[PDB]
Amino acid sequence: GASPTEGSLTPFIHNAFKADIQICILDGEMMAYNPNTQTFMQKGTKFDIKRMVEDSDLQTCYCVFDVLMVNNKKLGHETLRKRYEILSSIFTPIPGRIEIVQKTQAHTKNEVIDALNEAIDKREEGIMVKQPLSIYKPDKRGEGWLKIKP
């Protein structure tokens, strides 16, 4: 949906943005949410989030992890911490339709292994790590973002 009147995810989150924010760019991941369990349907069997069938009870959820512009302010060159803080003041999350990915501060390896073990326990792919001072470099790989899997 390109307008609040008609869409599959936008008609519900039109009014989820604080009044001050008028121009806003966000980056995130789109996934499928099962409400009867209140759990995210892991990608794979029984559904594709690209061409979901209307009759299905599953719905679309947007998990945000970055902001690149708010009220004609260019946040590309700022540090990750600042972008996170500004992101916290964009929308009031409304579970099931738009959310912010939680990030935990960690400064030891035991924490990383604990997180990976817990992720495997919750049947997730893995865990990723972000450098607090990393800048957004479009199209580049392995600059401030790292991923870890079993």
Next chain:
DNA sequence: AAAACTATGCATGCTCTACTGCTTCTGATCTAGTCGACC
């Protein structure tokens, strides 16, 4: 009493209108495969 004209019933041919069977076109359904984009 005999001959000529006319009426009516039936035979014959032709043409026109139902009803059954064969062939071909169209529509609806299923099954198999292809393309888009992502991960």
